[PDB]
Amino acid sequence: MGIQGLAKLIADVAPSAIRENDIKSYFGRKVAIDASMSIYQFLIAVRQGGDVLQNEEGETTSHLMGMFYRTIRMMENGIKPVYVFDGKPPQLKSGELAKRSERRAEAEKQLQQAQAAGAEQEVEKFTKRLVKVTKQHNDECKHLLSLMGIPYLDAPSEAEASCAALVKAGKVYAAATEDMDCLTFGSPVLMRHLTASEAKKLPIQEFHLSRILQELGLNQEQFVDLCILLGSDYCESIRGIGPKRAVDLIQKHKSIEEIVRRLDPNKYPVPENWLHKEAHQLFLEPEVLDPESVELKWSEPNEEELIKFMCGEKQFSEERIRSGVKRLSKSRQGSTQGRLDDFFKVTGSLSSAK
Amino acid sequence: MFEARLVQGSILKKVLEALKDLINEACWDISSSGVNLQSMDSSHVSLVQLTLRSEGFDTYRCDRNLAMGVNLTSMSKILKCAGNEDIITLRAEDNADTLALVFEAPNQEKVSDYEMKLMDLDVEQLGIPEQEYSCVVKMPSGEFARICRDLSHIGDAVVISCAKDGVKFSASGELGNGNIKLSQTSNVDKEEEAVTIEMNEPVQLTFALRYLNFFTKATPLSSTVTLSMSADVPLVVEYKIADMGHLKYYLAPKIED
Amino acid sequence: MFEARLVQGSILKKVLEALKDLINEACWDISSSGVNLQSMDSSHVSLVQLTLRSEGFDTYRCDRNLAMGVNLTSMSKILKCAGNEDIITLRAEDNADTLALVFEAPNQEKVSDYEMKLMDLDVEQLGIPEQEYSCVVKMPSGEFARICRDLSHIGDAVVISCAKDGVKFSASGELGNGNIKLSQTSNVDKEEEAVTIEMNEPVQLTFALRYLNFFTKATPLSSTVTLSMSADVPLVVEYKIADMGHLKYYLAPKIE
Amino acid sequence: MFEARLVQGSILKKVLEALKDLINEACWDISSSGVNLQSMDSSHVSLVQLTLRSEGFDTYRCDRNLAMGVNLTSMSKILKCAGNEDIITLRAEDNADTLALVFEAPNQEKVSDYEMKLMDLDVEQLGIPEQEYSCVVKMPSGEFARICRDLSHIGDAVVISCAKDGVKFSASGELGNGNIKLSQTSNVDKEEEAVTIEMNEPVQLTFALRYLNFFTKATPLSSTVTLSMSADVPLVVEYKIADMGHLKYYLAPKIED
Amino acid sequence: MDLSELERDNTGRCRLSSPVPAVCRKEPCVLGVDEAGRGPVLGPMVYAICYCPLPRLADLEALKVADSKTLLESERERLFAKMEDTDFVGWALDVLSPNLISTSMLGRVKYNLNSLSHDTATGLIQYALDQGVNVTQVFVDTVGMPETYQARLQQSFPGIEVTVKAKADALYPVVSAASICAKVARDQAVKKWQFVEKLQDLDTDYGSGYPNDPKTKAWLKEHVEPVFGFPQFVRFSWRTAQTILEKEAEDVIWEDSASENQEGLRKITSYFLNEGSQARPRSSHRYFLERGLESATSL
Amino acid sequence: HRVHLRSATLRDAVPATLHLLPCEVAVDGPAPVGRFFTPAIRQGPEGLEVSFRGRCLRGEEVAVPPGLVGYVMVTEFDRFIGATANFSRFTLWGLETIPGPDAKVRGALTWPSLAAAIHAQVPED
Amino acid sequence: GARQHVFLVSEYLKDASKKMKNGLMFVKLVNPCSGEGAIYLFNMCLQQLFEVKVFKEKHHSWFINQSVQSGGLLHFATPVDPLFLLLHYLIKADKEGKFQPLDQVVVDNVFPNCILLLKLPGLEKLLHHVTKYYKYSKEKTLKWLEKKVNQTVAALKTNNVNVSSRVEEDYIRYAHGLISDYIPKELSDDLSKYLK
DNA sequence: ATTTTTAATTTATAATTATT
DNA sequence: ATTTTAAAAAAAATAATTATAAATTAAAAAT
DNA sequence: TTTTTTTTTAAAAT
CATH of the domain at G19: 2.20.25.530
The answer to whether E35 and E178 have CB atoms below 8 angstroms apart is no
Beta strands in A29-68 (DSSP E): 29-34, 47-48, 51-52
The answer to whether B240 and B53 have CB atoms below 8 angstroms apart is no
Of D181, D177, D147, D179, give the one whose Cα is nearest residue D165.
D181
Are β-strands B135-140 and B3-5 bridged in parallel, bridged antiparallel, or unpaired? Answer: unpaired
The answer to whether G31 and G38 have CB atoms below 8 angstroms apart is yes
Distances (CA, A) of F54 to E9, E99, F57, G66: 18, 7, 9, 21
Q: Which CATH number do you get for residue F44? A: 2.40.128.680
Measured CA to CA, the distance from residue E94 to residue G137 in angstroms comes to 77
- Contact of chains E and D by CB distance (3 or more pairs under 8 angstroms): no
Measured CA to CA, the distance from residue B178 to residue D147 in angstroms comes to 44
Size of interface C-D (CB pairs under 8 A): 56
Which residue range forms the structural domain that includes residue B249? 1-256
Chain breaks in chain F (C to N over 2.5 A) after: 76
- Find how far residue D198's CA is from the centre of its chain: 22
Distance from the C26 Cα atom to the nearest Cα atom in chain B, whole angstroms: 17
DSSP D55: S
CA angle D151, D154, D155 (to 5 degrees): 110
Burial class (CB in 10 A: 0-12, 13-18, 19+), E222: exposed
Q: Is A264 annotated as a binding residue?
A: no
Which residue range forms the structural domain that includes residue F96? 2-24+35-115
Any B CB within 8 A of D175 CB: yes
Any D CB within 8 A of C143 CB: yes
**CB of E106 under 7 A from strand I?**
no
Angle between helices D72-79 and D10-18 (to 10 degrees): 130
- Find how far residue A282's CA is from the centre of its chain: 18
Which residue minimizes Cα–C1' distance to I27?
A: C21
**CB of A149 under 7 A from strand J?**
no
Measured CA to CA, the distance from residue G172 to residue D29 in angstroms comes to 46
Are β-strands C236-241 and C224-229 bridged in parallel, bridged antiparallel, or unpaired? Answer: antiparallel
Distances (CA, A) of A185 to A175, A294, B4, B103: 11, 20, 49, 54
Give contacts of E 114-173 with F, CB under 8 A. Answer: none
Interface test with E, best of A46, A120, A124, A320 (most E CBs within 10 A): A120
Beta strands in chain E (DSSP E): 13-17, 29-36, 45-51, 90-96, 135-140, 161-164, 294-295
In degrees rounded to 5, what are phi and psi of residue G173? -75, -25
| Residue G148 identity (one-letter amino acid) | K
Measured CA to CA, the distance from residue C63 to residue E152 in angstroms comes to 69
Distance from the D80 Cα atom to the nearest Cα atom in chain B, whole angstroms: 30
| Total structural domains within chain G | 1
Contacts of C48 (CB under 8 A, 6+ apart): C19, C22, C23, C26, C37, C38, C39, C41, C248, C249
| Total structural domains within chain B | 1
Measured CA to CA, the distance from residue E192 to residue B38 in angstroms comes to 70
Contacts of F124 (CB under 8 A, 6+ apart): G125, G128, G129
Largest CA distance in chain F: 62
Q: Tell me whether residue G21 is in a domain.
A: yes
3-state secondary structure of A102: helix
3-state secondary structure of E104: helix
Measured CA to CA, the distance from residue G59 to residue F31 in angstroms comes to 19
Q: Tell me whether residue F65 is in a domain.
A: yes
Of C48, B97, G60, B203, give the one whose Cα is nearest residue D175.
B97
- The helix (H) or strand (E) run that includes residue C51 is strand C48-52
Cα dihedral A93, A94, A97, A99 sign? negative
3-state secondary structure of B104: strand
Of G101, G105, G121, G126, give the one whose Cα is nearest residue G48.
G121
The answer to whether B205 and B160 have CB atoms below 8 angstroms apart is yes
Distance from the G101 Cα atom to the nearest Cα atom in chain E, whole angstroms: 30
Contacts of A291 (CB under 8 A, 6+ apart): A165, A166, A168, A169, A171
Measured CA to CA, the distance from residue D117 to residue D119 in angstroms comes to 7
Distances (CA, A) of C235 to B227, C102, C171, C207, C253: 54, 35, 18, 10, 8
Q: Tell me whether residue G153 is in a domain.
A: no
The answer to whether A300 and A329 have CB atoms below 8 angstroms apart is yes
**Quick count: other Cβ atoms within 10 Å of Cβ A190?**
30
Of F69, F60, F49, F73, give the one whose Cα is nearest residue F19.
F60
- Window A305-334, strand J contacts by Cβ < 7 Å: none
Which residue minimizes Cα–C1' distance to I31?
A: D220
Question: CA–C1' span, A297 to I25, in Å?
Answer: 38
| Total structural domains within chain F | 1
Contacts of E55 (CB under 8 A, 6+ apart): none
Interface test with E, best of C22, C42, C44, C47 (most E CBs within 10 A): C44
3-state secondary structure of F74: strand
Are β-strands E161-164 and G37-43 bridged in parallel, bridged antiparallel, or unpaired? Answer: unpaired
Inter-chain residue contact B254 with A338, CB threshold 8 Å: yes
The partner residues of B69 in beta bridges, in order of sequence, read B27
Across the interface, of F19, F29, F68, the residue whose CB is closest to G10 is F68
Measured CA to CA, the distance from residue B241 to residue B225 in angstroms comes to 10
DSSP, residue by residue, E146-196: SHHHHHHHHHH-SSSEEEE-SS-TTT-HHHHHHHHHHHHHHHHHHHT---S
Experimental technique: cryo-EM
The answer to whether D154 and B78 have CB atoms below 8 angstroms apart is yes
Work out the end-to-end distance of chain G between its first and last CA atoms, rounded to an integer number of angstroms.
56
What's the CA dihedral at E261, E266, E267, E269 to 10 degrees?
Answer: 140
The partner residues of C31 in beta bridges, in order of sequence, read C34
Measured CA to CA, the distance from residue B103 to residue B78 in angstroms comes to 10
Are β-strands E90-96 and E13-17 bridged in parallel, bridged antiparallel, or unpaired? Answer: antiparallel
Are β-strands E135-140 and E161-164 bridged in parallel, bridged antiparallel, or unpaired? Answer: parallel
Within a 13 Å sphere around the CA of G156, how many CA atoms are in the beta-carbon half? 22
Are β-strands C99-104 and B166-172 bridged in parallel, bridged antiparallel, or unpaired? Answer: unpaired
Beta strands across the sheet bearing D246-251: D28-31, D34-40, D46-51, D246-251, D235-240, D224-229, D135-140, D196-199
Measured CA to CA, the distance from residue A251 to residue A219 in angstroms comes to 11
**CB of A46 under 7 A from strand H?**
yes
Inter-chain residue contact G74 with F105, CB threshold 8 Å: yes
Are β-strands C245-249 and C48-52 bridged in parallel, bridged antiparallel, or unpaired? Answer: antiparallel
Contacts of E64 (CB under 8 A, 6+ apart): E79
Measured CA to CA, the distance from residue C94 to residue C5 in angstroms comes to 17
Distance from the G72 Cα atom to the nearest Cα atom in chain E, whole angstroms: 11
Distances (CA, A) of A92 to A96, A163, A256, A277, A279: 9, 20, 18, 12, 8
Rg, Å, chain D Cα set: 19
Are β-strands D246-251 and D46-51 bridged in parallel, bridged antiparallel, or unpaired? Answer: antiparallel
The answer to whether E292 and E298 have CB atoms below 8 angstroms apart is no
Question: CA–C1' span, B237 to H13, in Å?
Answer: 40
Cα dihedral B151, B154, B158, B161 sign? negative
- The helix (H) or strand (E) run that includes residue A146 is helix A135-148
Distances (CA, A) of E216 to A319, D59, E211, E212: 20, 76, 7, 8
**CB of A94 under 7 A from strand J?**
no
Measured CA to CA, the distance from residue D123 to residue D25 in angstroms comes to 11
Any E CB within 8 A of G57 CB: yes
Beta strands across the sheet bearing E45-51: E13-17, E90-96, E45-51, E29-36, E135-140, E161-164
B contacts of C112 (beta carbons < 8 Å): 180-181
Measured CA to CA, the distance from residue B54 to residue B61 in angstroms comes to 9
The answer to whether A174 and A31 have CB atoms below 8 angstroms apart is yes
**CB of A227 under 7 A from strand J?**
no
DSSP C124: -
Distance from the B50 Cα atom to the nearest Cα atom in chain A, whole angstroms: 16
Measured CA to CA, the distance from residue D23 to residue D63 in angstroms comes to 28
Measured CA to CA, the distance from residue G136 to residue G133 in angstroms comes to 10
3-state secondary structure of C175: coil
Point out the nucleotide closest to E179 (alpha carbon to C1′).
Answer: H15
Largest CA distance in chain G: 59
- The helix (H) or strand (E) run that includes residue B171 is strand B166-172
C contacts of D78 (beta carbons < 8 Å): 153, 175-176, 178
Phi-psi bin for A240: left (phi > 0), alpha (psi -120 to 50), beta?
left
Across the interface, of C45, C129, C207, the residue whose CB is closest to E268 is C45
Measured CA to CA, the distance from residue E42 to residue E238 in angstroms comes to 10
Measured CA to CA, the distance from residue G113 to residue E121 in angstroms comes to 70
Of A71, A58, A89, give the one whose Cα is nearest residue A141.
A71
The partner residues of C170 in beta bridges, in order of sequence, read C159
3-state secondary structure of E198: coil
Of E189, E232, E260, E228, give the one whose Cα is nearest residue E100.
E232
Q: Which CATH number do you get for residue C23? A: 3.70.10.10
Of C53, C59, C52, C92, give the one whose Cα is nearest residue C75.
C92
- The helix (H) or strand (E) run that includes residue B34 is strand B34-40
The answer to whether A132 and A159 have CB atoms below 8 angstroms apart is no
Measured CA to CA, the distance from residue G130 to residue G147 in angstroms comes to 11
Point out the nucleotide closest to B152 (alpha carbon to C1′).
Answer: I26
Q: Delineate the domains of chain E, giving CATH numbers in brackets.
A: 4-191 (3.30.420.10)
Point out the nucleotide closest to E238 (alpha carbon to C1′).
Answer: I18
| Residue D195 identity (one-letter amino acid) | V
Q: Is A341 annotated as a binding residue?
A: no
Nearest residue in B to D147, CA atom: B81
The answer to whether E45 and E18 have CB atoms below 8 angstroms apart is no
**Quick count: other Cβ atoms within 10 Å of Cβ A308?**
10
Are β-strands D224-229 and C179-181 bridged in parallel, bridged antiparallel, or unpaired? Answer: unpaired
Measured CA to CA, the distance from residue E126 to residue E208 in angstroms comes to 32
Measured CA to CA, the distance from residue B99 to residue A255 in angstroms comes to 44
**Quick count: other Cβ atoms within 10 Å of Cβ A126?**
20
| CATH code of the domain occupying A6-217 | 3.40.50.1010
Angle between helices A220-230 and A276-284 (to 10 degrees): 130
Measured CA to CA, the distance from residue E157 to residue E137 in angstroms comes to 12
Nearest residue in D to C179, CA atom: D113
What's the CA dihedral at A64, A68, A69, A75 to 10 degrees?
Answer: 170
Measured CA to CA, the distance from residue D162 to residue A89 in angstroms comes to 79
Contacts of F38 (CB under 8 A, 6+ apart): none
Angle between helices E214-222 and E239-247 (to 10 degrees): 30
Burial class (CB in 10 A: 0-12, 13-18, 19+), C69: middle
Rg, Å, chain B Cα set: 19
E contacts of A49 (beta carbons < 8 Å): 72
- The helix (H) or strand (E) run that includes residue A104 is helix A94-117
